[PDB]
Design a protein around this ligand. Structure first.
Ligand SMILES: OC[C@H]1O[C@H](OC[C@H]2O[C@H](OC[C@H]3O[C@H](OC[C@H]4O[C@H](OC[C@H]5O[C@H](OC[C@H]6O[C@H](OC[C@H]7O[C@H](OC[C@H]8O[C@@H](O)[C@H](O)[C@@H](O)[C@@H]8O)[C@H](O)[C@@H](O)[C@@H]7O)[C@H](O)[C@@H](O)[C@@H]6O)[C@H](O)[C@@H](O)[C@@H]5O)[C@H](O)[C@@H](O)[C@@H]4O)[C@H](O)[C@@H](O)[C@@H]3O)[C@H](O)[C@@H](O)[C@@H]2O)[C@H](O)[C@@H](O)[C@@H]1O
Ligand SMILES: OC[C@H]1O[C@H](OC[C@H]2O[C@H](OC[C@H]3O[C@H](OC[C@H]4O[C@H](O)[C@H](O)[C@@H](O)[C@@H]4O)[C@H](O)[C@@H](O)[C@@H]3O)[C@H](O)[C@@H](O)[C@@H]2O)[C@H](O)[C@@H](O)[C@@H]1O
Ligand SMILES: [Ca+2]
Ligand code: NA
Length: 699
């Protein structure tokens, strides 16, 4: 249909605020049209509001309706929004009423701060994320000048621009425009800062090496982070040291009061061991973040209670992981955040780590960084040996290449490889080259798109000609249809590469839908969206080596509506596991599992004071890894389910909501309860399972 968009002005509302629901419509049906748009808002199974407006439209013409509504008085509630326009079509969105984003955070990011970005454009990228996904907080990533001197001043004046550690130009006015825009959607701005990093040559800033942490007991090698140009490093300091606290806390305060941030997103480099202080005592670094964090929270709350938000990145998250118990149990954080690497690879493992962080933290919110399809060179592939190459030829003499071979000796002026690609729809494309380089140095090549120079791309030296990487990419705007993408070796380029393929880097809808379901069904959200509708492909946020296509965009809008509409059932302080032995689940005709086994329908049991909640995630046709790409699941329809309950509980009604079905609208189901040789039960037909169903049953 032609209900093109439904969204609200703001990403979160306080009780009593005025909410402006917008419906964008275009009659596409051939002739003129006369009917109504009927608005209905639910809190879970209940209708709390209904309203209707007349609408008529000459074929082709568009309009935007506004329905007003007043956020009800109960704080911390989520709502589903339906708009039904009869034969024009329907649409949906969702609304979050919370006076504090820290209970139901929907965390995005901003990582680009160019001088050329107008106030209007800053506002647009922000509105888009607020409107489509209800993003209520933004992590400002790599905005600071130095990790130990965050705002660059000349005497007493703020410098209008400054260069960051990777040489990017950061504009003050742009950062401020973006912070303003975040604030205009009732968003909050969290500033990225390390817990313990200076930059090189820190002495003249009055930072003392006595505050540092060392790899020896003789204070000769301070832990660093080498960015590999003989010049740019981080150095690491002791969280517990009072003079480092004093120094860096002061920089956090400076950033709140000068930039107008609402909090600090505190980061770290993850596990280090056999760590010493300056003098030489050996110390367990794992236990030392919480006293820093507690003290940081204290000066931030004293400085300004409204701009004192605080989280800390727990790196390498897993059950009983490094620093996992101490930080989640003892650190005065508003919400928990954890970047996942390789110690929770299965849906069920990460599911358990999330549960640990919910239980340790006292059921305060949990956000995961968990870069989807990280290792995968996912998307449509144009093999390099099936392209048009000038002065270079194919070969097969280094293993692991894809297809029938790869292009080699791409190594001198005049060499060329031109790909004939097709863009299935207008938009941004991630042009990703898989390559080899063992020249012992960076190899370059110039990139041309439809005959116009776009960028000189670097190809990184690897260990061995048999080590394929695919981290040479550039993102570009493309019109639907044919295009030409050409690497030329010209005069100014250096080195040499073998070239395996070009890929239109694309997040895989299927994996992405399934991981988000798993995450939120478990009790967590996912920092995955930012800047101008980008999805996060790597720890360095300005990476655009993969793009979303339109189909996944729509799925993400459904998902983010669903986790806002149903947040009381997903993340409330009284949502807990209910997997305590008394509850099996039966599904007729398909394999089911409670531990998220490959090729099954996974059921997860959670409960609250009033509802028995069973999630189904559909792993049929797919493996049990959360991060990797995946095929469409085996969709199911009219699927008999049987839920064994507690011997005591009594089910009034059975409800099923799914982001995959009607935008997340709750549909009530008919169910018969009896009892049999192997438990007391209830039973019903599940109309459909695609990726994720949430069954909530009211007792
Ligand atoms: O075709 C490719 C592109 O080619 C051109 O641009 C190339 C670059 O050009 C300029 O740089 C010139 C120099 O280029 C080389 O630089 C060497 C570096 O590159 C290699 O790494 C390749 C990866 O590059 C990116 O990843 C960067 C970086 O990200 C992280 O580290 C940075 C991060 O560190 C801390 O934060 C860590 C972490 O903290 C956690 O708590 C948080 O959860 C998490 O979010 C944070 O990430 C700091 O606190 C942060 O401030 C900071 O941001 C990551 O940890 C690190 O490993 C990673 O390297 C890409 O995203 C990725 O895809 C690549 O794999 C080397 O391997 C690396 O060692 C080295 O540092 C040459 O060696 C130099 O000689 C040369 O002078 C630009 O400055 C660069 O931005 C360009 O990439 C085209 O112009 C471009 O269009 C093409 O796309
Ligand atoms: O002292 C280092 C100098 O060489 C560096 O560049 C290395 C080569 O770069 C290009 O070739 C890349 C090529 O490398 C391997 O094969 C090289 C040899 O292997 C074959 O036997 C071939 O017949 C010989 O010509 C060649 O010696 C990979 O296996 C292959 O797939 C790669 O495509 C140039 O074409 C070569 O001339 C270079 O040797 C460095 O970059 C230079 O600056 C240094 O002078
Ligand atoms: Ca190939
Ligand atoms: Na998988």
């Amino acid at each position: 249909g032609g209900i093109e968009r439904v969204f609200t002005d703001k990403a979160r509302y306080n009780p009593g605020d005025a909410v402006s629901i917008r419906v964008q419509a275009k009659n596409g049906t051939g002739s003129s049209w006369s009917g109504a748009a009927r608005l209905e808002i639910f809190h879970l199974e209940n209708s709390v509001y209904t309203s209707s407006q007349s609408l008529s439209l000459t074929n082709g013409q568009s309009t935007t309706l506004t329905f007003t509504w007043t956020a009800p008085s109960t704080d911390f509630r989520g709502y589903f929004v339906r708009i039904d326009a009869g034969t024009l079509g329907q649409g949906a969105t969702a609304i979050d009423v919370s006076s504090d984003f820290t209970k139901y955070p929907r965390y995005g990011y901003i990582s680009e701060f160019e001088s050329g970005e107008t106030a209007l454009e800053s506002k647009a990228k922000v509105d888009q994320l607020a409107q489509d996904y209800h993003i209520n907080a933004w992590q400002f990533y790599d905005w600071m000048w130095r990790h130990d001197k965050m705002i660059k001043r000349t005497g007493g004046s703020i410098d209008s621009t400054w260069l960051d550690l990777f040489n990017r130009e950061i504009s003050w006015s742009t950062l401020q425009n973006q912070i303003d825009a975040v604030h205009d959607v009732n968003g909050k701005a969290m500033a990225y800062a390390m817990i313990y990093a200076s930059r090189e040559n820190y002495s003249p800033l009055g930072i003392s090496p006595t505050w540092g942490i060392y790899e020896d007991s003789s204070h000769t090698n301070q832990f660093d982070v080498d960015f590999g140009d003989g010049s740019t490093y981080l150095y690491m300091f002791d969280p517990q040291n009072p003079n480092w606290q004093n120094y860096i806390h002061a920089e956090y305060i400076d950033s709140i009061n000068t930039a107008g941030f609402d909090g600090i997103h505190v980061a770290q480099m993850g596990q280090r061991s056999n760590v010493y202080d300056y003098n030489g005592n050996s110390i367990d670094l794992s236990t030392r973040f919480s006293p820093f964090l507690d003290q940081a929270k204290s000066v931030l709350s004293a400085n300004n209670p409204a701009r004192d938000n605080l989280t800390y990145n727990i790196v390498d998250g897993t059950v009983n992981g490094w620093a996992v118990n101490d930080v989640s149990k003892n650190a005065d954080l508003d919400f928990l955040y954890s970047e996942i690497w390789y110690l929770s690879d299965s849906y069920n493992q990460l599911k358990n780590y999330i549960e640990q962080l919910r239980a340790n933290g006292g059921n305060k919110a949990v956000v995961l960084a968990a870069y989807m399809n990280y290792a995968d060179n996912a998307g449509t592939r144009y093999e390099a040996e099936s392209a048009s190459m000038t002065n270079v030829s194919t070969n097969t003499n280094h293993a692991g290449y894809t297809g029938s071979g790869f292009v080699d000796q791409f190594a001198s002026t005049g060499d060329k490889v031109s790909f004939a690609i097709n863009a299935p729809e207008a938009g941004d494309y991630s042009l990703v080259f898989r390559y080899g380089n063992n020249t012992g140095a960076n190899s370059t090549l110039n990139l041309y798109v439809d005959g116009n120079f776009v960028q000189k791309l670097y190809f990184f030296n690897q260990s061995s000609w048999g080590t394929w990487k695919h981290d040479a990419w550039y993102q570009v705007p493309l019109t639907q249809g044919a295009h030409t993408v050409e690497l030329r070796y010209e005069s100014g380029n250096v080195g040499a590469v073998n070239l395996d393929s070009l890929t239109l880097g694309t997040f895989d809808e299927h994996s992405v839908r399934l991981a988000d379901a798993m995450m939120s069904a478990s009790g967590a959200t996912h920092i995955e969206l930012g800047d101008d509708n980008q999805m996060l492909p790597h720890e360095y946020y300005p990476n655009r080596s993969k793009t979303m296509r339109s189909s996944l965009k729509n799925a993400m809008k459904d998902h983010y509506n669903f986790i806002t509409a149903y947040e009381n059932l997903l993340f409330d302080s009284d949502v807990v596991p209910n997997d305590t032995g008394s509850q099996f689940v039966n599904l007729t005709g398909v394999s089911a599992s409670g531990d998220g086994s490959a090729n099954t329908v996974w059921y997860i049991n959670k409960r609250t004071s009033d509802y028995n909640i069973v999630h189904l995630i559909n792993l049929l046709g797919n493996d049990n890894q959360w991060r990797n790409t995946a095929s469409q699941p085996s969709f199911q329809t009219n699927l008999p389910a049987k839920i064994y309950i507690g011997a005591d509980e009594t089910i009034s009604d059975v409800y099923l909501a799914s982001p995959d079905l009607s935008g997340g609208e709750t549909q009530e189901l008919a169910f018969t309860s009896g009892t049999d040789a192997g438990g007391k039960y209830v039973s019903f037909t599940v109309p459909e399972l695609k990726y994720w169903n949430m069954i909530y049953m009211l007792e």
